[PDB]
Amino acid sequence: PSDMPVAHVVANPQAEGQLQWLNRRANALLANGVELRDNQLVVPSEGLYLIYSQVLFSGQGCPSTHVLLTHTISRISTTHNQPVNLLSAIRSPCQRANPWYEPIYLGGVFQLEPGDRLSAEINRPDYLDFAESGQVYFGIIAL
């Protein structure tokens, strides 16, 4: 089999209104050294990791105020407490009561070091939608 560090976590459906990564669920992974601490994935050993995450935002009708939805995956190494954005995207659901949906997918390969902490964050958890499985996830795999 494989002993490569791997994780695939999803939004916890019991933490409504928040983004709390969860691995205790069917079709989720957290193994071979990867840990979930303080809502962040912690890298076991150095190497090339494919990192990815998807969030789905939804709302009914368009707010009177212009809203921007952001999703970013950031890296925090032990050699610097300053978070660095590896992947980031923005979306504007409204131009100015029909429900809107906006998915954001981020993904790339990065050289990581042992102890590195990866965070997958959003700016509007009040719009996050994990009403159904597979809509919000965050993962990594050492290649």
- Give the interface with a second copy as residue ranges (CB under 8 A): 1-2, 4, 6, 8, 26-27, 29, 46-48, 50, 52, 54, 56, 58, 62, 65-66, 68, 72-73, 75, 84-111, 129, 132-135, 137, 139, 141, 143
From the CB of 46, what's the least distance to a second copy, in Å?
Answer: 6
Q: How far apart are CA 47 and CA 63, in angstroms?
A: 44
Q: How far apart are CA 74 and CA 53, in angstroms?
A: 11
From the CB of 16, what's the least distance to a second copy, in Å?
Answer: 18
The amino acid present at 112, given as its one-letter code, is L
Nearer to a second copy, 18 or 25 (CB): 25
Burial of 83 (0-12, 13-18, 19+ CB in 10 A): middle
From the CB of 38, what's the least distance to a second copy, in Å?
Answer: 21
Q: How far apart are CA 47 and CA 10, in angstroms?
A: 23
